[PDB]
Design a protein around this ligand. Sequence first.
Ligand code: HEM
Ligand code: HEM
Ligand SMILES: Cc1cc(N)nc(C[C@@H]2CNC[C@@H]2NCCNCCc2cccc(F)c2)c1
Ligand SMILES: Cc1cc(N)nc(C[C@@H]2CNC[C@@H]2NCCNCCc2cccc(F)c2)c1
Ligand SMILES: C[C@H](O)[C@H](O)[C@H]1CNc2nc(N)[nH]c(=O)c2N1
Ligand SMILES: C[C@H](O)[C@H](O)[C@H]1CNc2nc(N)[nH]c(=O)c2N1
Ligand SMILES: [Zn+2]
Lengths: 407, 411
Amino acid sequence: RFLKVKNWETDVVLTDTLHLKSTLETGCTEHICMGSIVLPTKDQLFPLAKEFLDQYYSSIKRFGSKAHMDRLEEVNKEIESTSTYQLKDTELIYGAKHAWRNASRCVGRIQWSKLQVFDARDCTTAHGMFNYICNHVKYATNKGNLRSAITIFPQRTDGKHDFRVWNSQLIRYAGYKQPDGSTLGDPANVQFTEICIQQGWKAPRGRFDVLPLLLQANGNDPELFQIPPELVLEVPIRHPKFDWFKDLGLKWYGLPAVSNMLLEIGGLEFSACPFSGWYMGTEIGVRNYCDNSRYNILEEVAKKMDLDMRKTSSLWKDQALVEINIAVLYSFQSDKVTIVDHHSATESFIKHMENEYRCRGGCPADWVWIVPPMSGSITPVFHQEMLNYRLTPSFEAQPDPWNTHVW
Amino acid sequence: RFLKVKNWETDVVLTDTLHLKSTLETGCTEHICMGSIVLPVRTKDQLFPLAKEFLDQYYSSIKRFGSKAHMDRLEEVNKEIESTSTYQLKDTELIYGAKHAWRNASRCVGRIQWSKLQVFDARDCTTAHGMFNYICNHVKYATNKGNLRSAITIFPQRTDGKHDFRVWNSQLIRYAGYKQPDGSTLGDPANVQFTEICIQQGWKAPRGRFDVLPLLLQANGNDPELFQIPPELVLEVPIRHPKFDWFKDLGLKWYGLPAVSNMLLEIGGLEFSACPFSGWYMGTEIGVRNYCDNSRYNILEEVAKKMDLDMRKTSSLWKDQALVEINIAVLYSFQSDKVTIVDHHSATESFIKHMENEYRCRGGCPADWVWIVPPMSGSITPVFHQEMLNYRLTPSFEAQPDPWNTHVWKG
Ligand code: HEM
Ligand code: HEM
Ligand SMILES: Cc1cc(N)nc(C[C@@H]2CNC[C@@H]2NCCNCCc2cccc(F)c2)c1
Ligand SMILES: Cc1cc(N)nc(C[C@@H]2CNC[C@@H]2NCCNCCc2cccc(F)c2)c1
Ligand SMILES: C[C@H](O)[C@H](O)[C@H]1CNc2nc(N)[nH]c(=O)c2N1
Ligand SMILES: C[C@H](O)[C@H](O)[C@H]1CNc2nc(N)[nH]c(=O)c2N1
Ligand SMILES: [Zn+2]
């Protein structure tokens, strides 16, 4: 019931108590662990509300107070006659910061309390959403000096009136199948690119074409908008030693803004809640550039370095991997766009973990995701035992809207 | 029940039925995943089922399920457990047992090789001197002048648990660690404790950076005894780099035989507490962990120094650069001296083919992601994108507490 996490590098042992306050289920059983699997009504709602409001009132040290009890009553009466309820702004701000605080896959949580929250619950149309999203992008980009933020559209009602952003990120590059057999652009985005073109998009058909927004309001058919080009900050990728690097014509965008997840606060579900922070180098350099299913540039780079690609054992893949990541980091710093490297990102998470154990009694963490996709054991997180569990408020994955929505 | 695992790189989807035969417990609950926790006497009562399970598997695997020979063996084991409270495995069953413990080891990336294991039956051993001879013969057979052969030596099983055979070393070959009065370490910091015990037991420590530790061997619950592996049986590889000639000047070497000696082998409910085993290294174990852990030889600084990388900001990736070169150096030295070794690209690609083949012939492959993924360059290796299901099958290799923590000193 009390659980120890040990760090095998520092021999430091922490004690987790926070997991007993966990509520959702993990995928794992006593027989079978699924740690590595990417995807493992009116009554129902009130305890969810009570659970949240209790923790909120506890956070502002007013637990049991009259103001506490009165909200609990108000919310209770709102649910009975309306079937749902509305969060107070203070409650919304708290809920969002905490969904982030609870995101066990996020290495970046030391930042969790500096979250700018934009209340877009007054939004009614897809046009509304487009305005709110541009202002989010502009505010978050902040001329390169990135600031973390979330925009929160109206909550689910009866499920046939959902707000949704169809893109998986606010900013992404198209993917087109070609007569060749090859893929041009980002292969991760083929299906979505095809949904856009069929929904009317004039696709330019290049390699780094910024995709349009596909925005759905009040459960209506999704509509299309182009982000103002002058709002999408992008970075050309060069290497500090390799002059030839620029000639791959590689670029990435500054703002990572996850747009496809679902925010749950006190039983209420926000289905469109784009949020953003900033990149950890390896996200672009290792995954976006090197995944076989992504831009897949290892072969090309190694060939420019004139490494012996005749055998795996020369570590030519590993050599080229490091330099691709040097270039990402160097390009972002040279243009003064915020980026953090994986040594510094994990160092920061270790410190935040220690803080969470000291001040909250634990920190849910998904080691599989927290450990960077390169150089795992030279980052401290690798040696850090972690306990994974699901707390609420939370961000969840949710079915791509096209599989479910009807026209 | 059908469980599906996906590969996010290829979209190949597999289906596990084998997990339906898992007995042991994970440490994971419906509420908590302990997937990254390192560490998450038997009655007649509880033994015959385990004997039975194992024998059923064994006889099913040889296409003899339900034969007279199967029934007679069950009856025979049952009676032996009856009068003597334990039972003795046939050679065939021990061999099959040991291969399966390997095949079942979910943290092992080298399992494409599970069927090729040399088994040394050392159940006739009675003394520490006896153990030492078995271990030398194992080191020599397995090393095979650099053309490495995988092998296991199995000493007698636990009886009442007061007469345990144990190899106090965690690996048969390992370098001593020496904590200094200034608080620094000489040699391998992971072996300071065990080094001291060896010194206490009477070993003359040479006190150098790469001293091969002596074997500390306990037979039949007796106090353990010191022995020196003959140096001529200890194959070592000096580490050098294909382009950087200053790399040799770092003075690094490493031994060729990885040989884990601290684990427990469970077969048919029987417990084999000294069962040292070996194969060959994957390069990253030496170059990433052994050399580059802060709590190990910790050579990143000194290497990157000699490369003149920019060490002012971590964001130049100086550590990543040096790491790759250290690992290029390890693979190069072993290859040049003709000592078997496998890089992590080749190993993980091998493990993936192994795993798919298992899902076809066996209906599954318990696999622990946290361990299967190498400690450098994770996502450019195919296992990173592989979903895996971790669960426990017997026979198995289990961690056991270190003997200096449990042993009753006899004086
Ligand atoms: C400010 C700096 C931030 C950093 C360095 C950071 C870093 C990361 C990284 C490396 C991942 C792994 C996901 C992947 O590799 O695809 C991740 C996932 C995630 N992050 Fe953070 N993030 C930041 C800001 C935020 C913010 C503002 C939120 C929420 C408001 C957030 C919530 C999440 C969630 C919910 C996941 C899991 C998402 C998924 O399953 O795809 N992060 N983050
Ligand atoms: C043939 C060459 C082999 C290779 C390349 C290989 C590779 C590996 C690697 C890289 C690990 C994890 C490394 C670590 O972090 O300690 C491992 C773990 C393991 N291997 Fe293998 N292995 C091989 C042979 C064997 C053999 C012969 C056995 C037993 C018959 C075996 C059983 C195990 C077990 C039980 C573990 C988990 C160890 C622990 O819990 O500390 N392996 N193997
Ligand atoms: C199927 C599925 C489930 C899931 N939970 N997720 C996915 C997106 C994949 C996962 N992993 C790569 C890719 N997602 C792209 C990277 N996501 C950005 C995380 C991040 C980073 C910095 C700041 C932020 F605000 C947010 C797919
Ligand atoms: C605490 C604890 C638990 C556990 N299960 N285990 C340990 C030994 C650790 C694991 N990781 C580093 C260190 N021991 C490293 C030795 N492991 C080599 C595996 C191997 C490779 C090639 C061929 C083989 F036959 C065997 C410690
Ligand atoms: C199969 C495995 O779960 C999958 O590849 C995971 C591993 N760890 C990851 N970690 C992060 N941060 N992002 C990912 O997309 C993945 N992919
Ligand atoms: C804390 C964490 O589980 C621990 O460092 C694990 C992670 N993965 C590993 N993987 C391998 N091969 N060997 C290890 O010792 C470890 N250590
Ligand atoms: Zn688990």
